[model samples]
Target chain A: GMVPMTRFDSATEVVRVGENRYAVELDPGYLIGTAMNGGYLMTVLQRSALAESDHLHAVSSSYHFHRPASSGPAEIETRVLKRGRTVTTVQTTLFQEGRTILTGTLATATLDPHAEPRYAAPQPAIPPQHQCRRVDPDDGFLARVDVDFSPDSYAALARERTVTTPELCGYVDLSARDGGSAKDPLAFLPLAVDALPPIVSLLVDWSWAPTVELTWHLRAIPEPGPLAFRSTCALVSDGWFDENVDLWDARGRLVAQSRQLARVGR
Target chain B: MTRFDSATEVVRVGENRYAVELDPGYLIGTAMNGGYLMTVLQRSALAESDHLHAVSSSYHFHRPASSGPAEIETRVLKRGRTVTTVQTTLFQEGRTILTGTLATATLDPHAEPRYAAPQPAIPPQHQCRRVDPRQSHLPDDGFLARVDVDFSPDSYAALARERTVTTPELCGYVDLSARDGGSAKDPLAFLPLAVDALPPIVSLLVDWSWAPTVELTWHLRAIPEPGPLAFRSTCALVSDGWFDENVDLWDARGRLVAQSRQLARVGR
Candidate 1:
């Protein structure tokens, strides 16, 4: 019997080998430049964490990328930092060929997708879907996942990227051609978090800007559908920039938010 | 000496370990507030790193920290030409307490934000109600007693777990308690306390026990004003009794001084 795999499930599926160690396989199809995308690695790191935890969602994950990980078999060791009734904090380290690649401290907890919101951020202000421009079908990461950018946003396929500020607003989801329903949205959020082009594209040419640090919080589980996304850059100082991404579910509730610091690439 | 400066002061005891005193006044109850503890942690890093400010720092609370002697162990992860990253682990009573990783760099005080979320709307300082320090349930002048927090009238009611109209945002102004020598110290070092000064955003909605923070990360965007900082907190979402809170503090210049987000459990 085979269980159908969602795009994220196919990319991040891991198997436990020991009480604390699990194995993962990285794919080059997910590569941004030469290294695997940061959020993709985040999903893989958190998947192993969820496998070991009793909680339901990865409430938060903060990663410090010590070095870039390549496309191949990698190992993750999940160490429980604290296991509380409400939340479980796990530290994950991804290793390749006996060397450390990146490390993360993830807090896993349960979230009610239908829970009435006590408070929620307003939905993004992007134009309607049909009015926006679809990302080039040939782009590396976009090819795997579909994305549509607002004409005002800094989408890569645009003739000349001009925007009032450093931000990109659009829609993103699992590609229809990928042959998988995005029914499992918890698994899909990490990729969606890093799905948009780096917001710094408004100021610089499109290049490989590797993330040095990334932190994301799953505010709520998403309803199954394409999510609206907006990534904004706070500042670019000393050749380093910061990006914050907010994702809203189909219901217009904010489902996830992420902040990352990356260096300006050549 | 500014008591806050003293409360957060750390002395290098070894190569990577620094001696810290968790000032009892900074204690909220039996445990220390995570933000106050963060300042002590920052001092340890400022001593080791060649950089001056912790531009981006992520914290994971393993267990409750207390008031007394403690030790922080720091190690330089990357000494980049642009920014120096360091990891600091706190230990108390021979037990691992909390771990923080910080990226530090020098920032220009006069620099403006390249981009910022809309500035929170709130009445001017005089229009808000000041939190009376004498009303605290603690045995002595606790964490709340060390700072002056002036809440917008509606937020003032919410602070008591009594709100007629409810939303997940709180607006206020905060600074060191004048009676506590807060006016005498440099405002830059105490920004963490301001970030954590608000009562939990959920406190505005329900009367639950104080929620312990699991993770908190703040980006220091710019230096703040000397006397008072405008503070606002808004929740992005709340589900299954767990909630996310984002805090933004701005200076009189309207520059975004610091932005922070934390995940915590809702009190039962």
Candidate 2:
């Protein structure tokens, strides 16, 4: 028996069928239950952006999750929104079976890994990795990935019926720190951004998909391994919620941050 | 004396172009405030649509928009009964300054929210003063003079220092100030500008620099009460010369009106 290659690069491969057009596989392994986890979907689009541009990172992106793209095949039609000296913005749409699945505006840039940052959102103080309880999806693509929620975070919510805190901190496996085996650290960031379960998942008993209009910024290129995830939902009001996620690299450098407006599902 | 009512006015110049009055007063020296440009885009969207409110407005700044005569191009994406989505681009001298997409919808003013956000209440106005960041790094007061954000006396003392604060957060009450020596006015036009009112939250922690926004997405939750609105600005990350600013804007009636998040280059 052999396991399929789940490397980030291969899993998110986008072949350029034509100019500014690419065909990507909506890998079933990236699904959250049945719906495609938006982060992995964004990576497919991000790979397409990189395929069509000279930049190394999708530094900034805002996505409208108009509809979910299922596991199969999809086509990405990308257009250059703006091309600048240091930065370029591209707009892309993921179409499947002639139905518009999702759309996004991505601003790409060449990131500096050697540049030292003046300030960073330090990694949250969480229990040791051995102490954290591994959170495995009941049955879905996430089980293929590695995630361990902090004891006071998701694990506590699973055991107790009532939870007070609106934050979840965890440690996620970074498949690659350097561009050796697969895509670089920047390429694995969208999964990290989308890794944290909805903060509402802890507070509310019902199921909810809390990211509809998702925006994220790729702040830096990492130096090595070890990545931490921190997600927070401060405001959950009438049929809507806001989830803010921060990812820190091995050196405690803030690598990426995401802000999403989600529909508190019915 | 001019007021916000007339300052944000745009005249239809062509089939898809609108002549913009980039009021110099909104300028903090040569560069126009990005929020003011966003407000102009929202106004253009509202003018073209039959919708009443811009519920979700997202913008990407291509370059600095200076105070001058500019034109806006509006393209309608979807015209549904509840939400009308439009895309707007602000250009001056044949160069694109900023691009945006706004989804406009009608809101019922009298309806109450099912779940209200539990934001810590802002301190009393007497214990607060206007947010003046010039003592750290200087900039023209043109835009600051037009908007008002009063911070608690405690946060003010903490922000004046360097790296002594406990958390990276700024809480305040914000509203529009009278401009051009005229009295204050609360019009629908001022709603969009309010989203960009607070200074960079990271400025409260590290040394202050001009953190120009790269992208901003704000949701107009409800129609705000016409008064000093409470706001909270917070940041969780700052690295690689970039930062995130998340803002929650609430009306005087204690109802959430709008929420915004922006990414900017961390200036140092």
**Highest lDDT against the true fold, candidate:** 1
Off by over 4 Å in 1: A1-8, A15-19, A96-99, A125-131, A137-139, A151-162, A165-167, A203-208, A233-240, B108-122, B135-139, B157-166
Across A6-33, the per-residue lDDT of candidate 2 in tens digits comes to 3666767789899888998887866787
Q: Which candidate is the best by DockQ?
A: 1
**DockQ metric for all predictions:** 0.45, 0.37
Q: What residue pairs clash in candidate 2, if any at all?
A: B241-B266
lDDT of each: 0.79, 0.73
True contacts kept of each: 0.43, 0.41
| Model 2 segments more than 4 A misplaced | A1-7, A136-139, A174-183, A205-210, A223-226, B12-17, B47-51, B78-84, B105-117, B131-141, B158-169, B180-188, B201-208, B266-268
Query: What lDDT tens digits, residue by residue, belong to model 1 across residues B140-177?
Result: 57888788889998888766656674467788888888
